[PDB]
Design a protein around this ligand. Structure first.
Ligand SMILES: [Mg+2]
Ligand SMILES: [Mg+2]
Ligand SMILES: [Mg+2]
Ligand SMILES: [Mg+2]
Ligand SMILES: [Mg+2]
Ligand SMILES: [Mg+2]
Ligand SMILES: [Mg+2]
Ligand SMILES: [Mg+2]
Ligand SMILES: [Mg+2]
Ligand SMILES: [Mg+2]
Ligand SMILES: [Zn+2]
Lengths: 136, 176, 134, 38, 135, 94
RNA sequence: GAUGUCGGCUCAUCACAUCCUGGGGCUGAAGUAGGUCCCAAGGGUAUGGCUGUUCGCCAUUUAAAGUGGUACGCGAGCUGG
RNA sequence: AGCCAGGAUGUUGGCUUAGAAGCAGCCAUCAUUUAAAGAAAGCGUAAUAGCUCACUGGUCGAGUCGGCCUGCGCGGAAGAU
């Protein structure tokens, strides 16, 4: 399960998730799983999808995870009123804008990479597309 | 489309009567009548029947294909005729014809008496065989289904009313 | 009609040939002695294949075939049992002169036209059992 | 009969048919493959 | 799937063997097991006969280059060719015995001298002996 | 030999570029040499099927701008964030 | 410048996510009996021991002893544990 | 697409197992006759058999296959007077 090893600060303002993605190209492998949607990926969703695609390629080839869940998410428990300080950190998300290449793969035939990515995509809360490496 | 474009050859001795959308096909084996869908334009000419779509109708070709198919089996009907063969499988299962009524013994308290419709005739060459004969392919098909319905082939012994050309897949009972 | 592989001078025990061919309708004492009388010329310690042709009157006629390809490669390399994992574990070695010896014997059953065609058909049986060509 | 949001062909003998505006999977080989979308 | 490169190669291989051979036998082979065929292939290679199953469209192409341009009307239904490259005859006799013993098929037509032989008159190339008989 | 047909851009900017893309066309630039850069428009479908071939990025292409022929080489490509579309192409005079 | 609270009694009314009865598909459905699901709301759907209890546990029934909404239905209707 | 025909040989590949003979598993996956036929995609046998597919020859006679950008629809869709 991915998570920052240490952080300058514990908690972070909600913020917004406007704009288009940076890192929209297959830069390490031969194939990629690109986000078409906008949303948050939790560390558990990222791991769930990583496990699915790894089992699929029978632990042959190489996998890259282009996303990192560095955003701390707080939550107020049940029977707790409003105020009295910001809630406690429970999980970590990665903000996802349309275009982000989430995962990359190489060392496997296109057909297999396509299936592995089909299996991982089902564990994600946002719409994805299969992408291939390009000459510029 | 590939079906509609293929012409139906009306043989010698077969009278075709077309009154708009109503077609009557008279032969040695009988006389059948059908009302074709408004989308169908049927042309006679020579010793053949040709079907095609009618302008303004969206599903014309699909309709003309069906119209063809029906008229082809109407022609076959009033000449050659159709034959469905059923065979009874299982202990005590027996059948007999008494005119237009098929008496069936199929393991029930009361014997089953099935009344045949106009044009379908039946004969039992064996106590375990029913042979249906008629001109209407749909009606013969219907009667064959209704007779099968009394006792549909069971999957553990193949017991029941089955078609002659029927493949009855059987299975083993739950182990223990 | 059944296919079996019985020893050169042995045909009678219950576990290998007993109720396997006897269940169809073949005489257990008539075939057992008629087979060993014809396979007497065949060398000791060599499984010889035989095909049975039975009719409606329980009668039988058999045609003896040449020893199997996976059988002759064991005596030529000097092994009793083959490799559990072929091409992953080497169990023996056979020369090019030994490959043509098995092929010249198998000529009566082989589909090949030339000597090189029958030799390559024995080369495949050797690779799929762990034996390497040396 | 399997009623579910996702109806698919499970084998080569499976066939997708639309009967009275309802997607169905009719299979000639396996009765277990019979599906209705709902 | 056969590509045009493959089709042109098959026309070439059967066009080369067309010139060289003396007597060619065209026959049907539908409803015959591989066991009986591998048996007629052993009986063919021995008698110096070339055995092949070629697409009738591909045959009307290898045969257009003369002298079998009369075997055209025999390229309707399953076609099997028997090209005798070594000594004329061999096949026309090998097929007649295989036809009678197996009862399946009928044997289409034979060719020799650049002339058409009908299905009834195949007794002409069946009674011919050796080369190798004149001595 | 890749031959690309192009018109000179009668307009420039955000508004005008977005209007081209809606019209199944895309802006592109030709620069390099002593010559002034030429702002051009390309048919989306045509260039899209061309760039599918690896040779497009290596070979010298010819751009046909109102009769005139211009030998160029694909310098840079701006692709759509997630769709299989082209946003803009940089062409350098060869 | 008052909208009486839990449970019981009495009397109910609707929903269907159906407990029983009815129809039906698959079953790792021989039969008997089950499992699962689809359709179906017409009617029907225990009495007691303990506890203020609702619930629950227990006893013995029954084809079944449904799940919910109705100011957690019902005190200008009763009770007052 | 449909329909006719074939789908062979070494060989029951080796190991394992009471048996594993394409079809429990494990490993290898060539070579021959070839029009083509995986040392075998599924069902079947105690193991064999038997049935069919991948592939190919014939018939037929002109279109056929499924990805991309897109418009509008369909299912997913159960609630209480
Ligand atoms: Mg209906
Ligand atoms: Mg603006
Ligand atoms: Mg007041
Ligand atoms: Mg319901
Ligand atoms: Mg369930
Ligand atoms: Mg009710
Ligand atoms: Mg008391
Ligand atoms: Mg009960
Ligand atoms: Mg209340
Ligand atoms: Mg009061
Ligand atoms: Zn199926």
């Amino acid at each position: 399960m991915l998570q920052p090893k240490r952080t300058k600060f514990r908690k972070m303002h909600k913020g917004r998730n406007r704009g288009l993605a940076q890192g929209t190209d297959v830069s390490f492998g031969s194939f990629g799983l690109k986000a078409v949607g906008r949303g948050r990926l939790t560390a558990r969703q990222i791991e769930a999808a990583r496990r699915a695609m790894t089992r699929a390629v029978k632990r042959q080839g190489k996998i890259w995870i282009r996303v990192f869940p560095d955003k701390p998410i707080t939550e107020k428990p049940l029977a707790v009123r409003m105020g009295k300080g910001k809630g406690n950190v429970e999980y970590w998300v990665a903000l996802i804008q349309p275009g982000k290449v989430l995962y990359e793969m190489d060392g496997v035939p296109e057909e297999l990479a396509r299936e592995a990515f089909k299996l991982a995509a089902a564990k994600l809360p946002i719409k994805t597309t299969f992408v291939t490496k390009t000459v510029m | 489309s590939r079906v509609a474009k293929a012409p139906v050859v009306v043989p010698a001795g077969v009278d075709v009567k077309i009154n708009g959308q109503v077609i009557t096909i008279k032969g040695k084996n009988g006389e059948l009548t059908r009302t074709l869908n408004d989308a169908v334009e049927v042309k006679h000419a020579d010793n053949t029947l040709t079907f095609g779509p009618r302008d303004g109708y969206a599903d014309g070709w699909a309709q003309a294909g069906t119209a063809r198919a029906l008229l082809n089996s109407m022609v076959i009907g009033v000449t050659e005729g159709f034959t469905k063969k059923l065979q009874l499988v299982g202990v005590g299962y027996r059948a007999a014809v008494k005119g237009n009524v098929i008496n069936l013994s199929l393991g029930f308290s009361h014997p089953v008496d099935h009344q045949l419709p106009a044009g379908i005739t039946a004969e039992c060459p064996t106590q375990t065989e029913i042979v249906l004969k008629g001109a209407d392919k749909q009606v013969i098909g219907q009667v064959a289904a209704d007779l099968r319905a009394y006792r549909r082939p069971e999957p553990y012994k193949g017991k029941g009313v089955r078609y002659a050309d029927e493949v009855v897949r059987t299975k083993e009972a739950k182990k223990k | 009609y059944v296919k079996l592989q019985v020893a050169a001078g042995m045909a009678n025990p219950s576990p290998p040939v007993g109720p396997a061919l006897g269940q169809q309708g073949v005489n257990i004492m008539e075939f057992c002695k008629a087979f060993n009388a014809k396979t007497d010329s065949i060398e000791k310690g060599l499984p010889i294949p035989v095909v049975i042709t039975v009719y409606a009157d329980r009668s039988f006629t058999f045609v003896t075939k040449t020893p199997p390809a996976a059988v002759l490669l064991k005596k030529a390399a000097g092994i009793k049992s083959g490799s559990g994992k072929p091409n992953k574990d080497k169990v023996g070695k056979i020369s090019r002169a030994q490959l043509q010896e098995i092929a010249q014997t198998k000529a009566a059953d082989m589909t090949g036209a030339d000597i090189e065609a029958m030799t390559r058909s024995i080369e495949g049986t050797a690779r799929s059992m762990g034996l390497v060509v040396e | 009969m399997k009623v579910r949001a996702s109806v698919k062909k499970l084998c080569r003998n499976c066939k997708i048919v639309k009967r009275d505006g309802v997607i169905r999977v009719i299979c000639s080989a396996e009765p277990k493959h019979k599906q209705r979308q709902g | 799937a056969l590509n045009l490169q493959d089709k042109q190669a098959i026309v070439a291989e059967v066009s080369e063997v067309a010139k060289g051979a003396l007597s060619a036998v065209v026959a049907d082979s539908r409803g015959v097991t591989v066991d009986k065929m591998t048996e007629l292939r052993k009986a063919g290679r021995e008698a110096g006969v070339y055995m092949r199953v070629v697409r009738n469209t591909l045959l009307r192409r290898a045969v257009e280059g003369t002298p079998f341009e009369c075997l055209k009307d025999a390229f309707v239904g399953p076609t099997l060719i028997a090209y005798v490259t070594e000594h004329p005859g061999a096949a026309a006799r090998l097929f007649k015995e295989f036809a009678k013993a197996n009862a399946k098929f009928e044997v289409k037509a034979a060719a020799f001298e650049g002339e058409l032989i009908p299905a009834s008159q195949i007794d002409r190339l069946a009674t011919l002996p050796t080369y190798e008989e004149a001595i | 030999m890749f031959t690309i047909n192009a018109e000179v851009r009668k307009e420039q900017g955000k508004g005008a570029s977005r209007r081209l893309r809606a019209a199944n066309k895309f802006p592109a630039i030709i620069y390099g040499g002593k010559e002034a850069p030429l702002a051009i428009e390309l048919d989306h479908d045509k260039v899209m099927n061309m760039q599918a071939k690896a040779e497009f990025y290596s070979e010298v292409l010819t751009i046909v701008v109102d009769g005139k022929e211009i030998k160029v080489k694909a310098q840079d490509v701006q692709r759509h964030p997630y769709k299989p579309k082209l946003q803009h192409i940089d062409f350098v005079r060869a």
